[PDB]
Amino acid sequence: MQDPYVKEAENLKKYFNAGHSDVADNGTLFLGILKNWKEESDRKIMQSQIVSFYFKLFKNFKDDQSIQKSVETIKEDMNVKFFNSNKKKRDDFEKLTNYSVTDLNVQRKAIHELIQVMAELSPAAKTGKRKRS
């Protein structure tokens, strides 16, 4: 929601040497997809995956000190716009993204909670069913 965010995004573009005309090759990663979905719910579904992608990418460069300020500024813009500045929302999100699919114990809990998750994808009292089919 400001000029500083643009300034830091540009600094990252320079640092990653992503300003050459050949970068444009092979369509886009996120631009086209974000354009295909306008309903808020569909957008959140896609943005959630794009945001986790960026957090993971940034995490893989937490050593480069020179761009740390740029990254921190970008992450803050995401906390504000995507997480609405809600720290609990961001923490839960990050908890989900860190679960390991190869951890045998995590696997068992995931499989055990599967039915409840499925029930949560289509909330019973929220499914506008008015009459028997």
Where on the chain is the footprint of another protein (CB under 8 A)? 1-3, 5-6, 10, 13, 19, 21, 23-25, 27-28, 31-32, 112-113, 115-116, 118-119, 122-125, 127-133
Q: Where are the beta strands (DSSP E) in the chain?
A: none
Token pair recorded at residue 128: 């506008």
- 14 burial (CB, 10 Å; 0-12 / 13-18 / 19+) is exposed
Among 63, 122, 125, 132, binds a second copy (CB under 8 A): 122
Question: Rounded distance, CA 92 to CA 107, Å?
Answer: 19
Rank residues 72 and 120 by Cβ distance to another protein and give the closer one: 120
Length, in residues, of the chain = 133
Q: Give the footprint of a second copy on residues 23-82 (CB under 8 A).
A: 23, 26, 28-31, 33-34, 36-37, 40-54, 56-57, 60, 74, 77-78, 81-82
